[PDB]
Amino acid sequence: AETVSFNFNSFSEGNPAINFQGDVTVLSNGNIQLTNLNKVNSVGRVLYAMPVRIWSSATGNVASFLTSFSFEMKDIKDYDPADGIIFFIAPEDTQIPAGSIGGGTLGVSDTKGAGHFVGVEFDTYSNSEYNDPPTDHVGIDVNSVDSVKTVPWNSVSGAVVKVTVIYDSSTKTLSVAVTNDNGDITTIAQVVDLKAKLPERVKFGFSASGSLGGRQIHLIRSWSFTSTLITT
Amino acid sequence: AETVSFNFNSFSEGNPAINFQGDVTVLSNGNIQLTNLNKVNSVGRVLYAMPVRIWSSATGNVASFLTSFSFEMKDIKDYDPADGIIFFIAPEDTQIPAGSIGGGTLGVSDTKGAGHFVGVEFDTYSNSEYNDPPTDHVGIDVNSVDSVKTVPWNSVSGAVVKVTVIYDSSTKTLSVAVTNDNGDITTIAQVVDLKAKLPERVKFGFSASGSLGGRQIHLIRSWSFTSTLITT
Amino acid sequence: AETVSFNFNSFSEGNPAINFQGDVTVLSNGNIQLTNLNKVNSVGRVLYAMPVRIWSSATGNVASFLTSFSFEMKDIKDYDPADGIIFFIAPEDTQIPAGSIGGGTLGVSDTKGAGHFVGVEFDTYSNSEYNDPPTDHVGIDVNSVDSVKTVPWNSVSGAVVKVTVIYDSSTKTLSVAVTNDNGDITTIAQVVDLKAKLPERVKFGFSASGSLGGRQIHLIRSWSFTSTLITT
Amino acid sequence: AETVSFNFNSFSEGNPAINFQGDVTVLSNGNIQLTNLNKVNSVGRVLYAMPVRIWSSATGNVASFLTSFSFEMKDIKDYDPADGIIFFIAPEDTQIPAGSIGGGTLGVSDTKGAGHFVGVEFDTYSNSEYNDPPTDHVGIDVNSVDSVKTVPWNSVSGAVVKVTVIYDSSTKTLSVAVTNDNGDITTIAQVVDLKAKLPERVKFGFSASGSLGGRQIHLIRSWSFTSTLITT
Ligand SMILES: O=C(NCc1cn([C@H]2CO[C@H]3[C@@H]2OC[C@@H]3n2cc(CNC(=O)[C@H](O)[C@@H](O)C(=O)N[C@@H]3O[C@H](CO)[C@H](O)[C@H](O)[C@H]3O)nn2)nn1)[C@H](O)[C@@H](O)C(=O)N[C@@H]1O[C@H](CO)[C@H](O)[C@H](O)[C@H]1O
Ligand SMILES: O=C(NCc1cn([C@H]2CO[C@H]3[C@@H]2OC[C@@H]3n2cc(CNC(=O)[C@H](O)[C@@H](O)C(=O)N[C@@H]3O[C@H](CO)[C@H](O)[C@H](O)[C@H]3O)nn2)nn1)[C@H](O)[C@@H](O)C(=O)N[C@@H]1O[C@H](CO)[C@H](O)[C@H](O)[C@H]1O
Ligand SMILES: O=C(NCc1cn([C@H]2CO[C@H]3[C@@H]2OC[C@@H]3n2cc(CNC(=O)[C@H](O)[C@@H](O)C(=O)N[C@@H]3O[C@H](CO)[C@H](O)[C@H](O)[C@H]3O)nn2)nn1)[C@H](O)[C@@H](O)C(=O)N[C@@H]1O[C@H](CO)[C@H](O)[C@H](O)[C@H]1O
Ligand SMILES: O=C(NCc1cn([C@H]2CO[C@H]3[C@@H]2OC[C@@H]3n2cc(CNC(=O)[C@H](O)[C@@H](O)C(=O)N[C@@H]3O[C@H](CO)[C@H](O)[C@H](O)[C@H]3O)nn2)nn1)[C@H](O)[C@@H](O)C(=O)N[C@@H]1O[C@H](CO)[C@H](O)[C@H](O)[C@H]1O
Ligand SMILES: [Ca+2]
Ligand SMILES: [Ca+2]
Ligand SMILES: [Ca+2]
Ligand SMILES: [Ca+2]
Ligand SMILES: [Mn+2]
Ligand SMILES: [Mn+2]
Ligand SMILES: [Mn+2]
Ligand SMILES: [Mn+2]
């Protein structure tokens, strides 16, 4: 079988394993800061630099994967704590959408909320234009920030959040478990056919965005990943 | 919300927080050894001593859970490496079945392979009587060791195995990710209606068994768990 | 710290983690076959597709690494069993030298035996033009196939050879252990300043070559690697 | 050539291939436990029972060797996680020093830290009396626990650690690569003249020790070794 495995306990500028897009910076403590607090419609994205073959046109086989990551969102004075982080999967040539308005688009979609990606969003602002639920939520996104499904959640300022994601290729189930600061767990699961929605080779990463009035600290602290594709 | 959370980096004999059943022993290194290598049809089980409320009869709500554990199976001289470990969920009064034949029953079922439990087995012997697949496998069990579903796997002697399990109450999906020594991940997922198959309060744990000719080292090294049931 | 880690138990075409150069093919059994048995001066190379940051101009720190691989060389009818395999490190833009004569160059050097690389060669033909010792040998190469140091060895046709390599950044020592089919171990070690001989970002891989009359099967069976660079 | 080769996937107290010294026990799971958790100044050692000829007074030739082993150190409640494991080489008549104080001596030296051995220590306590560095460290020891050289390391409780050691007789270099649970590799290398420091025939093994208030689980899980001495 074909396996891709990596583990980041910290990050650094110049690490050839990570592609930096937009307003991303690496802090002295090793954290990734995705948005620029002084910029309007800020968008910052980080990608694992190696394309991952998630499915094969030869065998028809689809990879399974296990990934865990930790993030933090922190309020800043005066601005609205917005807009959130998305863990996403996209074609290997993925770039911040041209003319990105940031905000509710989470840096992966156009103004209408459409794009080419599969993601798990940690959304902290209700965008009526994208049919967002009225509170903070975890969403499963398929080519749109108008989530296929959401679950109520709560983004706690300065709290370290742990996430575990399992993609089971046979059932095509994307399962998500979010461990909050107060100890409670939040889960969401959705059948997503990665072979039907994505190309054979993709990139995995994180994206975050803000607007003129909606800005907050968006940090990626750690990330581990393992994918295995049966080669038969 | 109502949350049950715990973490075991090690185990100990004088700990009332764990129920020890049958042939289970705690080694000086802190590992749980489930079966007795010198006994015929050995069966040993461990349970978290506090019952977990997985569903409310008042609200009809079902808990989601996230659990991770690590184990080891090791071959022993002159015996068939058998029978395997099962991570299981059962009624609070669960005990080793009366007159247990061990072996293929994995210590949770009768001779016909029936019982009252939901489990994830790591099965290292092919029992034709329970319609086992021909190789080592991971299986999702519902009141039977004749698995609802299996996936081929490989039990590596002396290798430390890591498992992550997510139960998403809304989709009723039980997702499992198994991290092998060679780095590959094995996944299996199945819709299991925990509210329909189990009582309000349940016990979580591990069981393993052997027979006259089938014996191996079955170790539980660590276990973390979090369940959250919405109380509104 | 910054760590690159991977493990290949087998290989496959289309794996974006591997760069294929020249006459390389992947066999149905998962082995990499480096040279083309029907081509004159055949040269094939495989590289880990992600550049590795072996040192940083900012801190002056140099990475340490541990790598293990297994190979096989097998005689073919009529042709001379030649020329061998080289495990090498080179600048990230590395390509088969333009107008490569293959042969004793091992696919990493020019006709004079010069190049920009550090390698460990498993040499099966004595090239007087490169001051080769009179028998099969393991050599340590620094920008030349005229080895800095060699040790007598024996390439057994159809034998699976295991290699372990340690690079200790503090002493700048490149240590090599080769486990022969007859059970004996062969070692060779040399101080090589990777910071002085190579750029900050490099590629690791294998190369093999043949000539008109010198051809043999060159197989790469498995490869594991871990490098760690201390960061500011 | 003269070659000694062996491989232990498990160990037993009833096998003549190993010598057991002091407080060493073999667990039913097959692991070697070097120290007794309930004893003051506990010392336990194991040795490969056959003496290995590492050098020749006839030819002056010195053997090369490749060895790999895996261990685990685990914290115990109320005791300082101390003192560590040492992989050592010593005269064939080697015994635990008479009146051993355990602790910082790692079971191989006297109170002043002196002894007759060459070793690789995995030290988890800073003994100012032996000029220990302030954190956990891997050290190369020549007749003293006041290491010739050390490298910062981190002993993770309950983590399985993998070690590879290459001794190259021509350069007299002892190279060590340690693979941690967080994925990073730690290396240390030192020129050590075995002919000058040790007799022709030596014993290879492991030792660990504790004190009154410094105790932890010290386990040896597996060990493979190959040495080759040129007899021509
Ligand atoms: O004066 C009067 N009315 C006041 C008024 C307001 N205005 C205007 C002036 O200008 C404002 C304002 O209205 C809208 C306009 N504007 C401009 C903009 C532009 N930016 C924007 O829209 C945002 O920036 C947008 O980009 C955005 O929200 N991004 C999101 O930000 C998020 C973070 O927050 C996330 O990041 C997201 O992802 C991202 O999408 N946003 N808003 N003009 N007049 C009347 O007299 C009144 O007093 C009155 O009637 N009294 C009494 O009434 C009685 C009723 O019975 C009786 O009649 C009485 O007789 C009568 O006396
Ligand atoms: O494969 C195996 N065995 C095969 C086997 C044999 N059998 C047969 C054997 O025989 C039984 C049975 O099938 C039915 C049969 N029988 C025979 C009878 C007939 N008598 C009766 O009923 C009569 O009535 C009789 O009693 C009688 O006549 N008196 C009456 O007494 C009265 C007194 O008052 C009056 O006098 C009356 O007049 C008088 O009639 N009734 N029943 N079935 N399977 C291994 O063992 C198996 O364990 C194994 O492989 N282990 C595995 O190992 C693995 C590791 O390698 C893993 O660990 C696995 O997990 C683990 O599974
Ligand atoms: O160089 C190359 N190609 C060209 C070439 C030509 N030749 C030479 C060699 O030899 C021939 C020929 O040119 C002419 C020469 N000859 C032959 C003879 C014959 N005498 C006769 O016939 C006489 O008669 C003689 O026999 C005689 O006198 N008897 C006695 O005479 C008495 C008389 O009284 C009595 O009668 C006695 O009884 C009787 O015994 N006289 N002269 N050699 N190489 C290679 O391809 C090169 O590219 C190469 O190596 N690549 C490497 O390839 C490797 C794999 O291999 C690796 O892959 C490497 O990395 C790669 O670099
Ligand atoms: O060290 C240990 N144990 C022993 C010990 C002793 N101490 C204490 C106890 O004692 C000392 C000292 O600290 C200070 C204290 N002191 C001494 C004094 C002297 N009094 C005085 O001076 C007074 O004056 C007194 O004498 C007095 O009042 N008279 C009158 O004084 C008058 C003066 O005018 C007139 O003279 C009168 O005539 C006369 O009657 N005043 N204060 N600390 N530790 C550890 O266990 C050790 O083994 C250890 O760490 N192991 C390590 O463990 C690790 C795991 O953690 C790893 O496993 C390692 O590998 C392992 O190595
Ligand atoms: Ca939103
Ligand atoms: Ca079975
Ligand atoms: Ca050559
Ligand atoms: Ca010490
Ligand atoms: Mn949303
Ligand atoms: Mn089964
Ligand atoms: Mn050579
Ligand atoms: Mn020390």
Closest-CA residue to D213 (of D81, D121, D110) = D81
Q: Using the mean position of ligand 9's atoms as its centre, give its distance from the Cα of residue A82 in Å.
A: 11
Closest-CA residue to B190 (of A63, A174, A171) = A171
Element (H, E) at A175: strand A173-179
Mark out chain B residues that contact chain C at CB-CB < 8 A: 182-183
Burial of A99 (0-12, 13-18, 19+ CB in 10 A): exposed
Tokens of D85: 């494991």
A40, A212, A216, A218: residue to mutate for ligand 1 pocket, most atoms within 8 A of CB: A212
A7 contacts on D by Cβ (under 8 Å): 182-183
**Which residues, other chains included, contact D97 with Cβ-Cβ below 8 Å and sequence gap of 6+?**
D105, D107, D108, D109, D110, D115
How many distinct structural domains can be found in chain B? 1
Question: Is there a contact between C3 and D184 if contact means CB atoms under 8 Å apart?
Answer: yes
**Which residues, other chains included, contact B112 with Cβ-Cβ below 8 Å and sequence gap of 6+?**
none
Which residues, listed in sequence order, are joined to residue A91 by a DSSP beta bridge?
A: A202
Whole-number Å distance between alpha carbons of B140 and B121 = 7
Q: Which domain range does residue C58 map to?
A: 1-232
- Using CA atoms, how far residue D21 sits from C103, D74, D81, in Å, is 56, 21, 22
**Which residues, other chains included, contact D71 with Cβ-Cβ below 8 Å and sequence gap of 6+?**
D85, D122, D160, D161, D163, D206, D218, D219, D220, D221
Q: What is the 3-state secondary structure (H, E, C) of chain D?
A: CEEEEEEECCCCCCCCCEEEEECCEECCCCCEECCCCCCCCCEEEEEECCCEECECCCCCCECEEEEEEEEEEECCCCCECCCEEEEEEEECCCCCCCCCCCHHHCCCCCCCCEEEEEEEEEECCCCHHHCCCCCCEEEEEEEECCCCEEEECCCCCCEEEEEEEEEECCCCEEEEEEECCCCCEEEEEEECCHHHHCCCEEEEEEEEECCCCECCEEEEEEEEEEEEECCC
Question: Is there a contact between D183 and C66 if contact means CB atoms under 8 Å apart?
Answer: no
Whole-number Å distance between alpha carbons of D88 and B138 = 41
D28 contacts on B by Cβ (under 8 Å): 27, 33, 37, 217
Q: Using the mean position of ligand 10's atoms as its centre, give its distance from the Cα of residue D162 in Å.
A: 32
Three-point CA angle C129, C135, C136, nearest 5°:
95
Question: Helix, strand, coil shares of chain A as percentages rounded to 5?
Answer: 5, 50, 45
Residue type for position D170: S
Contact D127, D144 (CB under 8 A): no
B183 contacts on C by Cβ (under 8 Å): 7
Element (H, E) at B194: helix B194-197
Tokens of B5: 């959370």
Residue of A nearest to B168 (CA): A187
Of B64, B185, B228, nearest to A66 by CB-CB distance is: B185
Three-point CA angle A135, A136, A137, nearest 5°:
110
Question: Is there a contact between B29 and D160 if contact means CB atoms under 8 Å apart?
Answer: no
Whole-number Å distance between alpha carbons of C34 and C82 = 12
Three-point CA angle B90, B94, B96, nearest 5°:
115
Distance from CA of C222 to the nearest CA of B (A): 12
Q: Which residues of A are annotated as a binding site for Ca(2+)?
A: 123, 125, 127, 132
Which residues, listed in sequence order, are joined to residue D223 by a DSSP beta bridge?
A: D8, D69
Which residues, listed in sequence order, are joined to residue B189 by a DSSP beta bridge?
A: B175
Whole-number Å distance between alpha carbons of B35 and A143 = 50
Closest-CA residue to B37 (of B5, B75, B69, B9) = B75
Q: What is the 3-state secondary structure (H, E, C) of B170-181?
A: CCCEEEEEEECC
Torsion sign across C-alpha atoms A51, C204, D179, C180:
positive
Q: After which residues is chain D broken (C to N over 2.5 A)?
A: none
Distance from CA of C18 to the nearest CA of B (A): 17
Contact A203, A53 (CB under 8 A): no
Whole-number Å distance between alpha carbons of C100 and C103 = 9
Q: Using the mean position of ligand 7's atoms as its centre, give its distance from the Cα of residue C127 in Å.
A: 5
Measuring from each residue's beta carbon to the nearest atom of ligand 3, which residues come in under 6 Å?
A: C 80, 82-83, 103-104, 125, 127, 211-214
Whole-number Å distance between alpha carbons of C94 and C184 = 35
Torsion sign across C-alpha atoms A150, A154, A158, A161:
negative
Burial of B65 (0-12, 13-18, 19+ CB in 10 A): buried
Q: Can you give the resolution of this entry in Å?
A: 1.8
What residue has token string 């394309």?
A51
Whole-number Å distance between alpha carbons of D215 and D81 = 5
Neighbouring C-beta atoms of residue B16, cutoff 10 Å? 6
Kindly give the pairing relationship between strand C137-144 and strand C149-152: antiparallel
Least distant ligand from the CA of C101: 3
Q: What is the CA radius of gyration of chain A?
A: 16
D116 appears as a binding residue in the annotation: no
Element (H, E) at A229: strand A217-229
Tokens of B26: 């705690």
Mark out chain D residues that contact chain A at CB-CB < 8 A: 182-183
Contact B96, B41 (CB under 8 A): no
CA atoms within 13 A on the CB side of C168: 24
CA A120 to chain centre: 6
DSSP B128: G
DSSP A153: -
Closest-CA residue to C189 (of D152, D117, D88, D66) = D66
Whole-number Å distance between alpha carbons of A161 and B106 = 37
Burial of B2 (0-12, 13-18, 19+ CB in 10 A): middle
Tokens of A2: 């074909």
Of C9, C17, C53, nearest to A15 by CB-CB distance is: C53
Element (H, E) at A223: strand A217-229
Burial of D113 (0-12, 13-18, 19+ CB in 10 A): buried
Q: Using the mean position of ligand 7's atoms as its centre, give its distance from the Cα of residue C109 in Å.
A: 12
Closest ligand 1 atom, residue A212 Cα = 24
Whole-number Å distance between alpha carbons of D26 and C39 = 58
Listing DSSP states for A111-125 in one string gives TTSEEEEEEEEEE-S
Question: Is there a contact between A185 and B64 if contact means CB atoms under 8 Å apart?
Answer: yes
A9 contacts on D by Cβ (under 8 Å): 182
Length of chain C, in residues = 232
Whole-number Å distance between alpha carbons of B207 and B84 = 8
In the complex, which subunits touch B with 3 or more CB pairs below 8 angstroms? A, C, D
Largest CA distance in chain C: 57
Contact A179, A68 (CB under 8 A): no
Residue type for position C205: G
Q: Using the mean position of ligand 3's atoms as its centre, give its distance from the Cα of residue C213 in Å.
A: 14
Question: Is there a contact between A6 and C7 if contact means CB atoms under 8 Å apart?
Answer: no
D121 appears as a binding residue in the annotation: yes
Whole-number Å distance between alpha carbons of C201 and B53 = 54
Whole-number Å distance between alpha carbons of D156 and C118 = 34
Distance from CA of D217 to the nearest CA of B (A): 6
B42, B211, B216: residue to mutate for ligand 2 pocket, most atoms within 8 A of CB: B211
Whole-number Å distance between alpha carbons of C158 and C201 = 35
Length of chain A, in residues = 232
D26 contacts on B by Cβ (under 8 Å): none
Tokens of D65: 């060797």
Contact A161, A70 (CB under 8 A): yes
Closest-CA residue to B115 (of B150, B151, B89, B136) = B89
Distance from CA of B39 to the nearest CA of A (A): 38
Largest CA distance in chain B: 57
B166-198 b/e (C-beta count within 10 Å ≥ 16 → b): bbbbebbbbbbbbbbeebbbbbbbbebebbeeb
Residue type for position B172: K
- Using CA atoms, how far residue D113 sits from B63, C133, C140, D21, D208, in Å, is 58, 46, 39, 19, 14
Whole-number Å distance between alpha carbons of D87 and D136 = 16
Neighbouring C-beta atoms of residue C178, cutoff 10 Å? 20
Q: What is the CA radius of gyration of chain B?
A: 16
Q: Mutate one of B61, B150, B185 to test the A interface: name it (highest A CB count within 10 A).
A: B185
Distance from CA of B25 to the nearest CA of D (A): 11
Three-point CA angle C153, C159, C164, nearest 5°:
60
Q: Mutate one of A3, A7, A201 to test the C interface: name it (highest C CB count within 10 A).
A: A3
What is the rounded (10 degree) CA torsion for C192, C196, C199, C201? 50
A107: left (phi over 0), alpha (psi -120 to 50) or beta: left
Contact C204, C91 (CB under 8 A): no
Q: Which residues of C are annotated as a binding site for Mn(2+)?
A: 121, 123, 132, 137
Whole-number Å distance between alpha carbons of D223 and C6 = 23
**Which residues, other chains included, contact A140 with Cβ-Cβ below 8 Å and sequence gap of 6+?**
A119, A120, A147, A148, A149, A150, A174, A176, A188, A189, A190, A192
Tokens of D80: 């300082």
Closest-CA residue to D76 (of D136, D121, D124, D21) = D124
What residue has token string 């609200």?
B59
Helices (H), ranges, chain A: 194-197
Backbone angles phi, psi at A32, to 5 degrees: -95, 125
A110, A125, A132, A146: residue to mutate for ligand 1 pocket, most atoms within 8 A of CB: A125
What is the rounded (10 degree) CA torsion for C10, C14, C19, C24? 70
Listing DSSP states for chain C in one string gives -EEEEEEESS--TT-TTEEEEET-EE-TTS-EE-S-TTSTT-EEEEEESSPEE-B-TTT--B-EEEEEEEEEEE--SSSB---EEEEEEEETT--PPTT---GGGTTTS-TTSEEEEEEEEEE-S--GGGT--SS-EEEEEEEESS-SEEEE----TTEEEEEEEEEETTTTEEEEEEE-TTS-EEEEEEE--HHHHS-SEEEEEEEEE--SSB--EEEEEEEEEEEEE---
Distance from CA of A66 to the nearest CA of B (A): 7
Kindly give the pairing relationship between strand C173-179 and strand C159-168: antiparallel
Question: Is there a contact between D27 and B29 if contact means CB atoms under 8 Å apart?
Answer: yes
Closest ligand 3 atom, residue C125 Cα = 57
Backbone angles phi, psi at B162, to 5 degrees: -110, 135
